[PDB]
């Protein structure tokens, strides 16, 4: 459970105009590519943040 632009315990104090839940299945070793600033088979050609 990793947050980048916010801290995970501040989430209940904040209020947003839109929340989008992007949902998909990948293999465990490539979970680390689901982050800002990443490269790799998924990060560059499949799913990018």
């Amino acid at each position: 459970f990793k947050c980048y632009g916010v801290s995970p315990t501040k989430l209940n104090d904040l209020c947003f105009t839109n929340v989008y839940a992007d949902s998909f299945v990948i293999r465990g070793d490539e979970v680390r590519q689901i982050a800002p600033g990443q490269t790799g088979k998924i990060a560059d050609y499949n799913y990018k943040l």
Binding site: D13, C15, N18
Partner: protein, 50 residues
């Protein structure tokens, strides 16, 4: 989309610590005579502060 927080009543014309939809600060809340349009949520100063 707001978190599980309980709202309270607003106190006018006093120095208060406020939180409006996650927007926080300290100041006195008073009735405005500003002509807000139906779509405008808040206004800003030259300093880019609320």
């Amino acid at each position: 989309v707001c978190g599980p927080k309980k709202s309270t009543n607003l106190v006018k014309n006093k120095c208060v610590n406020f939180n409006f939809n996650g927007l926080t600060g300290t100041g006195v809340l008073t009735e405005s005579n500003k002509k807000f349009l139906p779509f405008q949520q808040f206004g800003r100063d030259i300093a880019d502060t609320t």
